[PDB]
Amino acid sequence: IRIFRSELQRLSHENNVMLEKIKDNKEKIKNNR
Amino acid sequence: HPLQVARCTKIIKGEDAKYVINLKQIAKFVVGLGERVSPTDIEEGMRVGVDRSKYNIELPL
Amino acid sequence: VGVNKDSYLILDTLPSEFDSRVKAMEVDEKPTETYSDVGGLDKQIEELVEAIVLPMKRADKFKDMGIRAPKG
Amino acid sequence: HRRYDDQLKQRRQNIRDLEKLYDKTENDIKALQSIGQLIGEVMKELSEEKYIVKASSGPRYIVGVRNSVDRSKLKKGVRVTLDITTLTIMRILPRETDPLVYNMTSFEQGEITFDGIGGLTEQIRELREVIELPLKNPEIFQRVGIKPPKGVLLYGPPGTGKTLLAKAVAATIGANFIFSPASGIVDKYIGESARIIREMFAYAKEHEPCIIFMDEVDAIGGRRFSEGTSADREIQRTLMELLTQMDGFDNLGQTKIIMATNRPDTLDPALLRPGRLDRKVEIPLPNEAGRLEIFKIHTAKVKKTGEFDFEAAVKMSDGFNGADIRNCATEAGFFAIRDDRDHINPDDLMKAVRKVAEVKK
C-alpha cells in the first residue's frame, strides 16, 4: 500500500497549485466584472 | 418627494433594491437577479425613478 | 449584454429579464371554443380543417409521401 | 490492495481536466484587459497619411494612421476602426452601412440547378456566352472585338421563370447570388434612393465573384413624358443612378446586372439604350406540352406510383410553373391520406388542381 502513496502525494499538491492559481483568478474575475 | 428627474452613474449595490438606472435615453440600464417590489422607498428614494421606459422591477415607484 | 459605461467594452452576458416583450400579448393555453358557436362558416371551417387541422394531427403520413404540409 | 490504483488514475484525470479549464479562465481574464476602439467610415481622402472620416459615436472627424495600414485596400469610403484616444485608424474593415445580408439577399453560389430552367437551353447557351464566358475568360470577346453586355433583362409572367432563372445563373457559374428587389428602393418615405445602389455597387466591388439580381422592375419604372419628376421623386433618382453605374468611371466587370419584370415597356428608355441593357430574353408560358417537363421536377421528386400519368393532370393545369405546382403536389397527397397509401394517386392530383385554382389562375 506504499506504492500508490508516492504518486498520490504529487497529485495532491498539484491540485493545490491549481486551487491557489484559480483562487486569485476567482477573486480577480469578480473584480473585473 | 416630487421627482421630475432621476439618474445614477457607476453605483454598485446589492440584486435586491439595487436600482442603478439612468432615466436618460443615453446609457440605459436594467436590473436583474429576481424580482423585488418596493412601492414606498426602493433604495434611497431621491434619484431613484422611472419616467418614460419601463425597466424591470422599477414599476412600483 | 453587459458592457462598460465608460470604455464600452463587452464583459459578460446577462440573463433575460426585460426583453421589451411587448406586453398585452394574449397567451391562452388550450382555450374553450367550438365551431358550433359561430355558424355559417362551415365553408371556411372546412378549409381550416383541410389545410391546417388535418396536417397538424399527424406529420408522419405526409412525410412518407415526400411532400411538405402547409404551415398556415 | 491493488484496486486503489484506479482511484489514483481517476485522480490524475481530474488534475488534467481542471488544469485545462483553469488555463482557459486565465486567458479569458487577460482578454478583459484588452482595449477596444470605435468604428467609422472615411468621408473624404485628404492625403496619404490623413483621412476625413465619420465616427459612429459623434460627428465627422479627421484621423491619422496607426499600423498595418495598406494604402491600396484603404481609400475614401472604406470602413475604419477609429481610435478614441489619439484619433488614428487601428485596423481596416470592408465598407458596410445598411445591412447587406438583411435588406439584400446574399447566398453562396446558387441554389436552383439547371433542371428547372430546362426547355430554355437555346436561350441558355446564348445567356452563358454573354455572362458565364466574360466573367471567367474575358479573352473570348477580346479577340472578337465586342464589348461585354452589362444588363440582361429576364421578363415574363409574374412568378414564372423569374425565380428559376435567377438562382440558376449563380449556380452554374459559381458566383454568389445577390437578390436586390426593386420594391426596396422607391418609397413614400424621405430618402432611400442613392444609398442602396451605391452600397450595392460597393458590395460587388469587394467580392468579385458575385452577380446582382432584381425583381419587380415595373414598379420603379415608367417614362413619364419628358423624363421629369411629378410624384416621381424616388422613381427618377433610381432610373438615372442605374445608368451612371455601368457607364460611369467604375463599372462591375465581375458582376452582371439582372432585372426581372413583366414587359420591357415598363422600363425607362434611358436604361434601354445600348451601354446599359444590351440583352432582352422573353420568358414564354408553358402550354400542355410545355408543362409536361414541369411536373417531372417537383411532382416526380416526391413519392409517386409507377403507373402515375403526367398527361391526366396537365389537362386541368393552366399556367403552373415549378413553384406553382408545389401546391398541387401538396394537395395531391392530402386526398391519399384517407386510403393509407405511401404514394400519390394520379386521380388525387387532378382533384388537387381544383384546390389550387381557388388561389392560382
Place this chain on the structure above:
Amino acid sequence: FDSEKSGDREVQRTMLELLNQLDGFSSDDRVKVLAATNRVDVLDPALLRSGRLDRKIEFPLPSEDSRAQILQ
C-alpha cells in the same frame, strides 16, 4: 409600392425574421403560424409557397341561419 420597410426597420425586420422562423422546421406539424386581417391589398411571392401563408380564405358576413345561433 413603397420601400418604407427601410425607413421604419420595425416592419422590415419583423418580416425578415418571419421568413427565417417559418423555415426552421419544415417537416414538423408543431410549427404553425397563421394570420387574419380585413383584406389583402398586397401579394408577396416570398410568402406564397408550401409551408407558409398561401390559401386565401375570405370571411363574408354571417348568413341568415348563422345569425340564429349567435342570437341564441
